[PDB]
Amino acid sequence: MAEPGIDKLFGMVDSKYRLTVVVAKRAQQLLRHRFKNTVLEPEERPKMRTLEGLYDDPNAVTWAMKELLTGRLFFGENLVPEDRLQKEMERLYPTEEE
Amino acid sequence: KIKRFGRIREVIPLPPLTEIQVESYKKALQADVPPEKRENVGIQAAFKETFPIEEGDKGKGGLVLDFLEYRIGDPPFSQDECREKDLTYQAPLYARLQLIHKDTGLIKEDEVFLGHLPLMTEDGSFIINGADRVIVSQIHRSPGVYFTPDPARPGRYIASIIPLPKRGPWIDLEVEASGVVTMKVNKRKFPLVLLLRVLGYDQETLVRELSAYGDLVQGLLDEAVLAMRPEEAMVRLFTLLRPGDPPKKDKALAYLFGLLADPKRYDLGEAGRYKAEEKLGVGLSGRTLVRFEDGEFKDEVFLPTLRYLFALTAGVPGHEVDDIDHLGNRRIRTVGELMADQFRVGLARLARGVRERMVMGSPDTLTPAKLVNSRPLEAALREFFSRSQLSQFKDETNPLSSLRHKRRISALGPGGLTRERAGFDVRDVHRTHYGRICPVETPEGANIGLITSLAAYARVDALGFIRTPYRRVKNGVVTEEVVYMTASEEDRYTIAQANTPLEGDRIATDRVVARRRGEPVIVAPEEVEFMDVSPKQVFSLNTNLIPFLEHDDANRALMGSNMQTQAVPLIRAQAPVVMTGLEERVVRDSLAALYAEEDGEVVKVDGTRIAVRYEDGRLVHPLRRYARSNQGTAFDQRPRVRVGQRVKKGDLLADGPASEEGFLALGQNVLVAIMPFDGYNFEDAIVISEELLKRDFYTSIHIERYEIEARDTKLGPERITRDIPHLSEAALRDLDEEGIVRIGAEVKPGDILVGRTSFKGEQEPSPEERLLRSIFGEKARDVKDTSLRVPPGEGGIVVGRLRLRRGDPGVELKPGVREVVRVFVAQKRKLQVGDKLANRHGNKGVVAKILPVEDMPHLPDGTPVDVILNPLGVPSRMNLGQILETHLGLAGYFLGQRYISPVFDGATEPEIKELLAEAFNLYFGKRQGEGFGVDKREKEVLARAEKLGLVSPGKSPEEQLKELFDLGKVVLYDGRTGEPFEGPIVVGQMFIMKLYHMVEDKMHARSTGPYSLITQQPLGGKAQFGGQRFGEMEVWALEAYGAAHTLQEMLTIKSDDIEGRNAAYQAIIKGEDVPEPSVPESFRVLVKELQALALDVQTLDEKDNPVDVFEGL
Amino acid sequence: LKAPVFTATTQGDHYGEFVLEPLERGFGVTLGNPLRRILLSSIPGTAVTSVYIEDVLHEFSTIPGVKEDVVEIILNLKELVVRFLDPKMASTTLILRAEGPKEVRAVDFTPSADVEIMNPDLHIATLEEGGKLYMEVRVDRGVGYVPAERHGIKDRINAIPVDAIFSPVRRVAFQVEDTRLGQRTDLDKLTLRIWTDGSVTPLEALNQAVAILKEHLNYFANPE
Amino acid sequence: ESKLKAPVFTATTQGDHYGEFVLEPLERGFGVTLGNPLRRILLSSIPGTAVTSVYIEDVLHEFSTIPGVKEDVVEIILNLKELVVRFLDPKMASTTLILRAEGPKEVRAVDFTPSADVEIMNPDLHIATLEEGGKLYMEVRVDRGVGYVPAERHGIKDRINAIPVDAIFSPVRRVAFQVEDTRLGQRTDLDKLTLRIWTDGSVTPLEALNQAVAILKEHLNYFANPEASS
């Protein structure tokens, strides 16, 4: 019909652009660098379907919208240091390849 | 088996249709007539017109030089030979002059070599610089005087038109508030009593003898100071014409604007005297005002109109006659006329040159051929022919097209005050002109009215001007009507009673109103000149091509009238089942097909040339084969007959690019069945049954042309070689023999269509390289792989090449440009998902799906339908008769018949029914033949159709079928479901053409590719290809939305922002990360572009004083 | 009942109305269509795959001395129906030489092997005054409709590969009349006709057909 | 790498009904070629067990109302129609069903004279409510059928007074199916049948399909030995 329950998300946030923004940065820190920031890995993880079966979809926003309809995550003036907001990401293996 | 439908037809559509031209140029280019006869217009006019170059001091000594004959002749090369070598098919036109003296001597340089004149092909157009062009005929207000209501605020004015825009001044006499009577010749505003004074009229002798019944005079006298002495007058006027020349008394200059039929004369006598004399008081003489009589000036037209003005300002003769658009004031400058004046222009410069020479030089050292420098007639004339906006490209997608292109009346032309795209009085004008001698439903879009076509039977006879249709007057002849024709009414076609048409109520047209029936019933000399040779005349040549216009609502009918043009010759054209008589012609006056000459016979051998028609002499006929079209259509010519005579209901002798044997066949007619189809025919999209393809139906061939020019730039001659650097891959000579690709060389996108090598020295390789180079035998290079290669267009078999290089003959080539390779590629284009199918009634729609014969509505016997044209909206919404054809369709399927149902004449619903009664006694006659009859399905249906009060209950099933067949169509299964379509579903053979669009040509797709080094946004390249536009509208779209990021992306990471751009083609090629901008490439360049103008653009942060750190790298 | 009367008014390679008999009120199409469907679609056939001509570079030509036009020529050959008389031939390649005046109607092909120019006449080329035509024209065994994809390589040069139309079935319909005694005027009277054919016979089309449908039907075997 | 000449048949076994099935890659033009006849045949031809003729001591015809009973002939009549019977051994043309009515209590389809070899698949099913007039006596018939049949078979049985209901015998009671396109095989226009057999008139779904798959199969045979004319 649409996505994994848009109406549901548009409920949580106040300003329709909030959800848009949070889901955005979210995925944009999720499988954007790491991949281990999931909240859907117990048995509620996004999977696809092709020839040999499933395989989580690379689409980052996907999880987010689903990882956001969940319970974790937060948003406001919280976590303050954007610096220590990613510095803490070092404490837990990040980086990509080039 | 051709069934005609109709009535009368007293004459013919009037050959050759391409007569607006053809027989226009000739009569202007009189040339072909012994220098003894032929007197005015064009060629000679312009000659005689251009007064014998006078000289210094009005006849004081030697040098007169008059003109005699004119000599067109010994043409250069040859058509085809031109288009090939980019030569403007012209011909040498020299003219015999002879300067006089005053010291004994009458020199005469024979011929006096001169400028070139482009000729008009038999076709009725010209080849200019290689390509084909047609001179479109424009229309302006027929020279004269009409007055008209002052647009400002109530208070008419007076306009005085001149022979033709580029000739004579367009004057206006206006009665105003503050000033009173302004005579505005060209760019000026001088009191009107002033010129009058000179001319003679003035205080008392003027007013109180001219203006009385309507004051408006106290002001025409205010400057009586001016009206106190002529001569001194001309000078005050002269002194009113910038710049500050010598106020000295002259008479000259004003030796024009009336004097001498040189710059003001609608000559002959026609179109000028008739006008005013039958508008103004009466009586006149060639040109406004008359001087050189004996000192003073004897005016003719000037005050009488000023008179006729006031009469129109409180008087009775009134008549606010304006640019009344009445085609009694709408001139039509045929080519010859357009080409004439330009020949006039040339002399308006030749002379300047001569007058110049006449002087300087010595009287004896001067002779023709010497004072003459045949340069003006060139340029001024070649400039026009191929540089005008009235000298267009040849529309040649389908034969009708180009034909139509001549039958076109333009208006967005160059003429004086010629309505510009939005000239002063655009709309309002467009409107149908009650003068119906020009198409009533031809215009296009956003360019309405301005560009009309032309009535079929329109114009012919001693042509002073305007279209004039045809009109009967009791069997008589036709008397070429005359737009300002009053001939006691005309009686619309029909009511026929052999010769007396006993009516009682003759539906007739008189003046304007569709007045009931004047019923003059004079039988003989038919109610004045009442009656109209056929109805066709109320229409344009390609609209006529609509078998059932009568129903088709005007408007939508234009989407067919026009659309039809955009056809495109197919492999199996087929005329149209139902068809109106004209087709037997439109593709025969188009000269697109070959026409036998005298008697019969043949010989041939077949193939690339019908070899003569063995009667008398002999003439092998070459058949233009798989040529190339301006639109890239690909018009070709098929032959006919092994051993025969002259004709058989047509001496065709080889078809052309769309004739089903002399029958214009734009598209192929197939079998359709109306009804929506699970959504594949939404809005207007059509559904194809693969079958069409399998039988290579709508397939169309197109041959494209490519071009690489070998320049000469100061880095090393740009050359077409087969030794392209490192391109070594077995490609080069794997094709491309001795430089250029070969014939039949099937081509894909990317191949080396044609290859050449530049030199371009970007950098000087320091050693190290030359070393490695030397070492690793890396033989140095001085050449780029600049080849031709086939662009993203799929390519296709290589139909033919062509090579042109200076040093060669006629070939004139861009300075430096040495050699210019050309290569044509063909492309059989079958039929795909997209493309407009559009028929004749304007049912234009794009193809959606092409189902397998598997699915698709099965007819009972099993034949499949062809196209599933949707009903919804389509007819109801557009109200048209695309049905009466689909009905007379099967009633011409089973009966194996083509039909002639002309415009507004025949093919009546009941007749169709009869034609439907038949075809069934066979269509169904077969069941009770093959051994079958109505099955459990048709039982279901009928018993539901009749319920839908569609069939007469009580009749038998079988009987209900014929009922439900002389309209709709038998049950009509659904090969997809196996079951039936409750409720009949009308079936039939429409006829869908296939317009020039066909997807392929549209649809590109970019991701990255070519970046431009001039602007900097996606575009211009060589490898892949793409680029797309983001015109503001889409910007608002995003603004209105909120995709800020999605927006800043389309003005950064995707065009100019080199950094960001790359961050894009990399952050992705990389992996888990997306395009991270920051500083916008634009903001960074706005500051360092304002600084150039010495402006400090201090950038400040939140607190105003955190002063940005931008461009701090 | 329990059994129908598979009537079968055959013909001579074409037509072939094939009547079943007292079919339960309804199956007239349960069977009646899928067959007609299949018949029209999947089924082996014989179609012109590629054609080489004497002095002709590629399509869009004009062989001097001949009336026609290579395109036409290929548009005509597109209709030639060959029979194969055997089952091992991926295809063969017909040949044809033609002199001065006359018509190269289909027949004129090289009389050879398990090949029946089922459709003689078939106006192939009204050449004359210049007998010149030598043509080598493939004829693979295909299925369904396969256009300019199946390259016409072969003569690797001027093959000018032609479109393929394999299905030998040339049209199919089927009445569902009701005219039996069985049990209460209800039953359907199936009677498909498998009209015209390329080379094969309706009883074969009709047969091969019932095959595929049974072959597919199977698929609804083991579910996961 | 998965599809080829062997499509994957995928069921949904909702249990007693809704047998959502999905055979997959099929050459464009078979999702129809199959899905339909099955669906077609599915809705018809298939053994059954449907009440077809009723008798309720007292009032003749159907257009009535029996006092001390919350319903009215039709409602009961219709209820009965939703009754799901099943027969034990093969030799049961149709054993009738009779009834015993008490006070205010409900008359579930269970009260039915608990005859063995014929157990009402569906216990509940209102049937009709009666109170201080617990009369209601019925001896309804049942039958083995093929598809669906109106009021034309006539409820013979109890000679007079029958108000014969309609013959709704066919365990399947609705069959839909849409063939979308899927491109497992590179090509993007392949067929994807998918069926959905709603049945509970007794027999299971997958049973219906298969059984019908046979029903069609067998008929196909017929096109075996012919009798032609030259």
Ligand SMILES: CO[C@H]1/C=C/O[C@@]2(C)Oc3c(C)c(O)c4c(O)c(c(/C=N/N5CCN(C)CC5)c(O)c4c3C2=O)NC(=O)/C(C)=C\C=C\[C@H](C)[C@H](O)[C@@H](C)[C@@H](O)[C@@H](C)[C@H](OC(C)=O)[C@@H]1C
């Ligand atoms: C030198 O001539 C030029 C003068 C321009 O200046 C200017 C101001 O003066 C114009 C004059 C005097 C016209 O008479 C004219 C015109 O008659 C016309 C269209 C445009 N109509 N099309 C819009 C697009 N749509 C899909 C089809 C209709 C025009 O815009 C103009 C036009 C101008 O713009 N057309 C039609 O009436 C119709 C109904 C069909 C014509 C058929 C084809 C389409 C044409 O033959 C094409 C091939 C070319 O001929 C033109 C591009 C000319 O360019 C050249 C180089 O040949 C152009 C006339």
